[PDB]
Amino acid sequence: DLTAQVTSDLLHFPEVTIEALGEDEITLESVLRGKFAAGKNGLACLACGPQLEVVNSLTGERLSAYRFSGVNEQPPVVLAVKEFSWHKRTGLLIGLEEADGSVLCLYDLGISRVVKAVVLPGRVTAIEPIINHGGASASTQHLHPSLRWLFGVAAVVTDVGQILLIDLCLDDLSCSQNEVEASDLEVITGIPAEVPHIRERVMREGRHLCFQLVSPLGVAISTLSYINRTNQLAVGFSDGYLALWNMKSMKREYYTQLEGGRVPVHAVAFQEPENDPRNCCYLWAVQSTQDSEGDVLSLHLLQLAFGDRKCLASGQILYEGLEYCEERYTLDLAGTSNTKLLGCQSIERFPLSPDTSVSVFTWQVNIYGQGKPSVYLGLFDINRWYHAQMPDSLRSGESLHNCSYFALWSLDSVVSRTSPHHILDILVHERSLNRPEQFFNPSTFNFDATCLLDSGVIHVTCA
Amino acid sequence: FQMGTLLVLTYTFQNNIPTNLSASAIWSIVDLVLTRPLELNVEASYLNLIVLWKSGTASKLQILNVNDESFKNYEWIESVNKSLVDLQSEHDLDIVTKTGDVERGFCNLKSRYGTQIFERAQQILSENKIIMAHNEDEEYLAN
Numbered sequence: 062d063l064t065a066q067v068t069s070d071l072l073h074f075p076e077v078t079i080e081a082l083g084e085d086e087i088t089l090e091s092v093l094r095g096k097f098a099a100g101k102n103g104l105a106c107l108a109c110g111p112q113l114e115v116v117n118s119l120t121g122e123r124l125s126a127y128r129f130s131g132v133n134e135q136p137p138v139v140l141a142v143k144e145f146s147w148h149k150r151t152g153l154l155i156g157l158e159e160a161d162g163s164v165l166c167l168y169d170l171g172i173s174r175v176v177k178a179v180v181l182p183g184r185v186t187a188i189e190p191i192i193n194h195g196g197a198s199a200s201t202q203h204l205h206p207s208l209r210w211l212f213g214v215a216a217v218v219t220d221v222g223q224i225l226l227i228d229l230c231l232d233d234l235s236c237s238q239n240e241v242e243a244s245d246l247e248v249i250t251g252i253p254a255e256v257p258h259i260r261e262r263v264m265r266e267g268r269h270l271c272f273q274l275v276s277p278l279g280v281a282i283s284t285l286s287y288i289n290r291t292n293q294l295a296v297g298f299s300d301g302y303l304a305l306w307n308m309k310s311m312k313r314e315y316y317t318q319l320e321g322g323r324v325p326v327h328a329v330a331f332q333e334p335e336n337d338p339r340n341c342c343y344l345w346a347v348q349s350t351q352d353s354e355g356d357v358l359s360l361h362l363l364q365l366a367f368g369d370r371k372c373l374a375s376g377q378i379l380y381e382g383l384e385y386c387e388e389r390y391t392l393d394l395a396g397t398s399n400t401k402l403l404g405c406q407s408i409e410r411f412p413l414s415p416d417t418s419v420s421v422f423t424w425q426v427n428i429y430g431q432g433k434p435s436v437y438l439g440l441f442d443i444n445r446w447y448h449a450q451m452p453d454s455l456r457s458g459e460s461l462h463n464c465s466y467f468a469l470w471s472l473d474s475v476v477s478r479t480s481p482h483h484i485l486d487i488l489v490h491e492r493s494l495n496r497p498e499q500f501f502n503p504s505t506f507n508f509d510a511t512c513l514l515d516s517g518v519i520h521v522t523c524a
Numbered sequence: 525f526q527m528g529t530l531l532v533l534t535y536t537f538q539n540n541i542p543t544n545l546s547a548s549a550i551w552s553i554v555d556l557v558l559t560r561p562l563e564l565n566v567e568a569s570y571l572n573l574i575v576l577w578k579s580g581t582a583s584k585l586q587i588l589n590v591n592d593e594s595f596k597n598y599e600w601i602e603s604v605n606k607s608l609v610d611l612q613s614e615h616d617l618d619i620v621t622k623t624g625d626v627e628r629g630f631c632n633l634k635s636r637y638g639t640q641i642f643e644r645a646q647q648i649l650s651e652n653k654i655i656m657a658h659n660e661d662e663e664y665l666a667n
Contacts, residue, residue, distance in 0.1 A: 198597065198598065199568075199588070199597045199598020199599035199600075200566070200568055200591045200597045200598070201591075201596065201597040202539060202541075202590065202592065202596025202598050203591065203592035203593070203594030203596055204594070204596065204597065206596070292592070309596070370593060371529070371570060371593015371595075372561065372569075372570030372590065372592075372593060373568075373569070373570030373571065373593050373595065373597055373598075374570060374573075374589045374591045374595060374597060375566065375589060375590060375597050375599070376561045376564070376566065376568050376570050376571075376589060376591060377568050377569065377591050377592040377593070378593060379570065381594075
């Protein structure tokens with residue numbers, strides 16, 4: 062019965078941060094959302110209505126704050142936030158939902174200002190940087206020639222299924238615009254040739270070039286992730302389908318409904334095994350109804366088999382030539398109760414392939430007529446799953462509490478300690494992950510983590 | 525620099541990577557060696573091509589770093605093609621070497637160059653009938 066132990070007090074955000082977010086009840090009915098940023102700057106971001114607060118992930122200190130304004134005199138909602146660094150600047154890409162449509166912003170943390178913005182032809186559901194620079198360089202050779210003519214590229218997806226690849230025009234240093242002065246896009250359907258001629262005109266007209274992928278419309282995209290090691294954009298749909306798009310060829314390489322059926326794809330996470338005999342790697346896909354009923358939460362492990370590995374001039378390894386993609390593990394966490402995924406995080410250590418690769422899933426279960434939720438952190442070890450002979454599900458009788466390739470931790474001490482504050486996100490600290498065959502079960506892994514709450518941060522150790 | 529992949533037998537193109545060379549491009553390949561990546565200032569690396577050009581007795585060493593398994597993102601890394609000792613001597617940046625006597629300069633050059641070269645040079649001198657007049661023939665040392 063592995064139980065996390067709390068190692069700090071609750072380190073509160075400053076009052077000014079708490080107060081600013083609590084203006085949630087005017088731009089209401091605004092939900093406070095918060096995530097640790099994926100990059101290497103130790104940031105966590107909280108958003109409520111038009112208000113963004115960037116805080117220090119370990120101390121709770123306020124680092125940056127901004128209240129977005131609406132181009133159409135009505136407050137936008139900060140919907141999506143991603144870390145993004147370019148040149149020698151550190152920033153965030155931000156998707157704003159507006160009454161009309163949407164705006165994609167580039168927010169500079171150095172000066173706490175929006176520096177670029179574009180109007181989106183739809184309602185954004187997710188955003189993802191693809192690359193932070195252009196120019197002819199070994200570092201962009203993995204991308205389709207047409208993207209290489211662009212200068213920074215962000216993917217943006219919408220509630221009707223548009224997939225947009227947008228030029229961030231990071232080569233234009235004369236243009237400093239806020240979210241109110243957003244530029245229009247020039248959207249070309251598919252992927253053209255003669256990009257430079259087009260681009261030059263497009264920018265003389267004060268617009269950003271956008272390639273919209275030829276892809277069916279009508280179903281909302283719910284998840285979006287660029288998988289660096291396979292050069293694939295993963296596009297998860299509200300109907301349970303998952304698309305993989307190769308960003309070299311710009312073609313959709315895979316597209317199938319996950320085994321949970323018509324339930325939205327809520328998150329993905331990539332893993333690479335240490336020793337696999339046919340260039341297989343893995344993509345977890347999480348299906349969840351947490352934004353509606355909250356009755357279904359399931360994990361789906363997709364095995365992606367490729368024909369080759371390629372060392373790029375950059376030094377990076379790339380899986381190339383997708384030969385098959387098939388679901389090889391399924392775990393139902395839910396499906397009265399209410400269950401929601403808090404986080405989904407992959408941690409890999411390299412000594413070629415990582416010698417350690419785990420995915421961490423954190424989820425919360427609320428039973429109706431039960432005040433305090435249970436919170437779980439589960440650690441899946443892909444190599445121990447190999448060692449266990451790749452079972453496709455928990456066996457009869459088998460439990461997460463006693464599984465050779467999965468460790469289950471209770472975060473209930475955190476819940477007791479922090480009530481009634483809500484856990485918004487959980488980050489495991491990669492650098493802390495530390496270790497008779499049973500001994501190499503992941504239950505013996507020690508690690509530290511930080512929970513992001515609505516009012517601060519708090520540190521835990523699992524040992 | 526074309527580079528594809530071999531597999532089964534099939535060769536399959538990936539990309540043509542040009543060179544970065546100017547002054548008309550008058551360098552000749554001496555040797556190239558494709559190999560496992562180095563420890564360069566860019567962690568984004570998949571493969572490394574070491575390249576050795578020549579133009580007369582002047583040489584040029586470059587490393588092409590390919591970032592990913594697509595051969596479309598890469599970066600050219602140059603190097604210094606003269607040693608510090610040589611650059612310092614050419615550009616008169618040498619503050620340490622003792623000045624003064626003509627024989628002082630003799631010791632200086634002897635010690636700097638090594639006997640193989642110093643004697644080959646003294647061989648070339650006498651063949652061309654250039655002979656040291658006296659202890660203090662500065663016109664000789666110059667040569």
